[PDB]
Ligand binder design. Structure first.
Ligand SMILES: *[C@@](O)(CO)[C@H](C[C@@H]1CCNC1=O)NC(=O)[C@H](CC(C)C)NC(=O)c1cc2c(OC)cccc2[nH]1
Ligand SMILES: *[C@@](O)(CO)[C@H](C[C@@H]1CCNC1=O)NC(=O)[C@H](CC(C)C)NC(=O)c1cc2c(OC)cccc2[nH]1
Lengths: 299, 303
């Protein structure tokens, strides 16, 4: 098993750069709107303690430089929505894919198209942690890079990059500008809460192991969802929700192993350990593959 | 900040993928200018693939025997030749989205991005390394043949891999875009083993430097080693020898971190002899060898 990103071309065709003063970052051009982090309006000193409503009052359309490559797109309107700026431009992007804006849950994965100066640089798969950070790879100039999933022909954008934390993980918003987690867009060191293991994804991984004939860990027991959640929390594992149980449905049907029987197997692995054994060639339980990723790599 | 297995953006390649069908055999092709490149075993029937005389099988085909679909459009084949294990279909239409490109044959230990495709449709993109035994640890399913591997520099796509085969061990084998396999493999329907799969030492060292740049030094030690004494231990553990060129190529990472290359060699020697003792590096419980020094430099320079 490996991390696989979605093909990035539909998103590449939407990346632009946005500059205000000497402050430059990336934006997302869909139809005639460009979406970007609102701190582009800040000088470096402004970002220490910004009052964004007051800073924006001092800006007009003609203070925003939007470029597709080196080609300028004239800005004809602007507004703030939470921590994102929306710049209306006078050109509808001919490369706009079918798209939606979605807000994901911890545990869900997405592809990040890391960009610099409006130019796509690399693509990789990330998982939203329970503490609402991602382990990205981002350098200066990466803000406004986006994360997304592709379903059929539709790009679902879920993430726009804003922040690195002192621990070197990343934080950002959805495309309506609402941060994931307790973070704010300020030039300040902010701590993320203690993280936990993504249980639903570990279960998906165990189903993947079974699909491939690696099933020594299957035990004879079952559990209730409540009892499992209480045990899991003592091992720093997330509780399962009903949605988690439901998204495990297809893998449960494919293998014939009920979700709560697999939970009882995992409980035993937590309580008793691996006994120097491996699962899918690994002593670590992997928690960054969703049930969809498992299906997507097995078929 | 951070270090992740990263692929190049795939859009320039997506615009070149098409579907090639001959008989009941369908796989992917690569459409550049007015030529479509694909694995020649498309011309094969199920019975042919056991021992295909490709020159014999190809001469019996006509241009119209090849159905090339690009999205909803069918491209008319107006010529066809064979270059080793790659078929070259001349089409009457030049692909308008052809990027600047070159064909290159990659060296073992180098990385490239793979755009996995099915029925001419891009499905996923990931980074691989060409292993010392000339296999790649890919993710490919039925119908993935003709998927390509590439690197991008500025605006130029260097195609280096086209996919053909899975081995019994689950690793993968393919050719360059001149149709020559990497490794001792053959495009016939047989179970093939690779040579011994050694570890790309210069890459493990780069990844250790990446781990240091990202704040983890638990594996470092106060010891050093000579290059030869390191290589003696490395070869004992089925690692490739480190050459002076590798040492030099690691210079920028050594400069950035302040850790002499042979001091990092002494760290790796200790990891090989003692193991990792349940600890992890950059989240991995194994020594990773599929990032090149340049992969690390481009993600971690300045951090
Ligand atoms: C965007 O490029 C800014 O436009 C930038 C992305 C980071 C640069 C290096 N890697 C990244 O992911 N974001 C920032 O520089 C933000 C700007 C905010 C939104 C105004 N700043 C931080 O992420 C930042 C500031 C501080 C800090 O201060 C003090 C102390 C510790 C961490 C930290 N992160
Ligand atoms: C191509 O899509 C075929 O067009 C296909 C890709 C593999 C399918 C499963 N995963 C893959 O990477 N390649 C093949 O099916 C090739 C066809 C050759 C080039 C004629 N064959 C193999 O991959 C192959 C055959 C055998 C085998 O036999 C008998 C025994 C064991 C492994 C094996 N692989």
């Amino acid at each position: 098993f490996r991390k696989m990103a979605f093909p990035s071309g539909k998103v590449e065709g939407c990346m632009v750069q946005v500059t205000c003063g000497t402050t430059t970052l990336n934006g997302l051009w869909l139809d005639d709107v460009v979406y970007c982090p609102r701190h582009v309006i800040c000088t470096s000193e402004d970002m220490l303690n910004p009052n964004y409503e007051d800073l924006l009052i001092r800006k007009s359309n003609h203070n925003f430089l939007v470029q597709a490559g080196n080609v300028q797109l004239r800005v004809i309107g602007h507004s703030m929505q939470n921590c994102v700026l929306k710049l209306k431009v006078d050109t509808a992007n001919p490369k706009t894919p079918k798209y939606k804006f979605v807000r994901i849950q911890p545990g869900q994965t997405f592809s990040v198209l890391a960009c610099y100066n409006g130019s796509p640089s690399g693509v990789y798969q990330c998982a939203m942690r329970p503490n609402f950070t991602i382990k990205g790879s981002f350098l200066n100039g990466s803000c406004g890079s986006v994360g997304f999933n592709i379903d059929y022909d539709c790009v679902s954008f879920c993430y726009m990059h804003h922040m690195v934390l002192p621990t070197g993980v990343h934080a950002g918003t959805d495309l309506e500008g609402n941060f994931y987690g307790p973070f704010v867009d300020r030039q300040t060191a902010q701590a993320a809460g203690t993280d936990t293991t993504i249980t639903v994804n570990v279960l998906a991984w165990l189903y993947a192991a079974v699909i491939n004939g690696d099933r020594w860990f299957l035990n004879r027991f079952t559990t209730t969802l409540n009892d499992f959640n209480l045990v899991a929390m003592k091992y720093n594992y997330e509780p399962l929700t009903q949605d988690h149980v439901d998204i495990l449905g297809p893998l449960s049907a494919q293998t014939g192993i009920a979700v709560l029987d697999m939970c009882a197997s995992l409980k035993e692995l937590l309580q008793n350990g691996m006994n120097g054994r491996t699962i899918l060639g690994s002593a670590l339980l992997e928690d960054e593959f969703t049930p969809f990723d498992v299906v997507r790599q097995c078929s």
